[PDB]
């Protein structure tokens, strides 16, 4: 149901996910994405074992007031962190079809607002950057919106470094997070944008 910007005017293709998008499924997706990215570094000498301390103390009875083994327990100041964090994952495999349904459903959200398909940045000339801003100006890209650029042109990418604007994404290596993270999607390079299955 979508047109084009530069290079032609077709678009129209793709049976986009029904009904008027599901936040619940996108939620399931983002969570998984952030869960995978999460590093499992957990600085804790949890065990009464791991902390540096001896093993016997001040006798079982008659010291008058105590009952202690050694200076390493979690009840001791400077002891173990019994139940503290240890290095782990949180990376899991979110069903394939849900990942596929994910970004499709996410693209659908950008259709219901501000979507953008382009055929080459012949409108760019070198890297220059100053000239990407010029091109963006022509297509309502002022800077009032966060923009996501998904091009395969290694030079049109090179003209993306700027502020409250663009995050530049390569070789159709897209993300449901990245597209929801920005206001507009410059879907650009119509390589993944058309033909599959």
């Amino acid at each position: 149901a979508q047109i084009n910007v530069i290079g032609q005017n077709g678009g129209r293709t793709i049976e986009l996910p029904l009904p008027e998008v599901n936040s619940g499924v996108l939620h399931e997706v983002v969570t998984w994405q952030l869960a995978s990215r999460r590093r499992g570094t957990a600085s804790t000498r949890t065990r009464a074992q791991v902390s540096k301390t001896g093993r016997k103390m001040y006798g079982q009875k008659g010291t008058g007031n105590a009952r202690h083994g050694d200076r390493s327990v979690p009840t001791f100041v400077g002891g173990g962190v019994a139940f503290g964090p240890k290095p782990r994952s949180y990376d899991y495999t979110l069903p394939r079809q849900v990942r596929q349904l994910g970004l499709a459903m996410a693209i659908a959200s950008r259709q219901e607002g501000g979507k953008l398909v382009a055929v080459d940045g012949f409108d760019i000339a070198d890297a220059k950057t100053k000239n990407f801003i010029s091109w963006a100006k022509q297509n309502g890209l002022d800077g009032t919106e966060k923009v996501l650029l998904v091009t395969d042109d290694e030079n049109t990418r090179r003209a993306a470094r700027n502020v409250s604007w663009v995050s530049v994404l390569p070789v159709a290596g897209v993300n449901v997070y990245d597209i929801l993270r920005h206001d507009r999607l410059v879907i650009d390079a119509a390589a993944l944008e058309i033909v599959e299955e």
């Binding site: 619940g24 996108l26 939620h27 399931e28 929801l180």
Partner: protein
């Protein structure tokens, strides 16, 4: 300019019933959780047995499991699905994937049709059902 809630990354909702909160042991003061004696911060009294019924019950038995066959029902071939053909590679591709074990045909479906089956064995009333409906069942040497 004014204060705005806005839709997107922050408008992403839980999903209702998606995931409830765990059990943190203090719902009022009056939580001195587990039992009240002999249910202790120890590593399990166990959960099976060795008299609690299992022992005190009999058998020397003898376990085997030589060859088990894949049940290829008659109703799969008959009723629906027009003869795409049996052979070996086609029965798999349609829906009867397993490897390691041989196949078997059993008499369940009743629609009557001409079919040529290529199973590794079949029941008396399975062979005497494909032929009666028209067709051959090919069993190897």
């Amino acid at each position: 300019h004014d204060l705005k809630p806005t839709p997107g990354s922050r408008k992403d909702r839980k999903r209702v019933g998606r995931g409830p909160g765990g059990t943190d042991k203090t719902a009022g003061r009056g939580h001195k959780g587990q039992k009240s004696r002999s249910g202790a911060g120890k590593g399990a009294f166990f959960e099976g047995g060795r008299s609690r019924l299992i022992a005190r019950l009999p058998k020397r038995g003898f376990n085997n499991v030589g060859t088990t066959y894949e049940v290829v029902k008659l109703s799969q071939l008959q009723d629906l699905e027009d003869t795409t053909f049996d052979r070996d590679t086609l029965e798999a591709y349609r829906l009867v994937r397993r490897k390691n074990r041989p196949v078997k045909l059993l008499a369940s479906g009743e629609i009557s049709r001409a079919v040529t089956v290529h199973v590794d064995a079949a029941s008396a009333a399975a062979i005497k059902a494909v032929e009666a409906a028209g067709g051959r069942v090919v069993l190897p040497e």
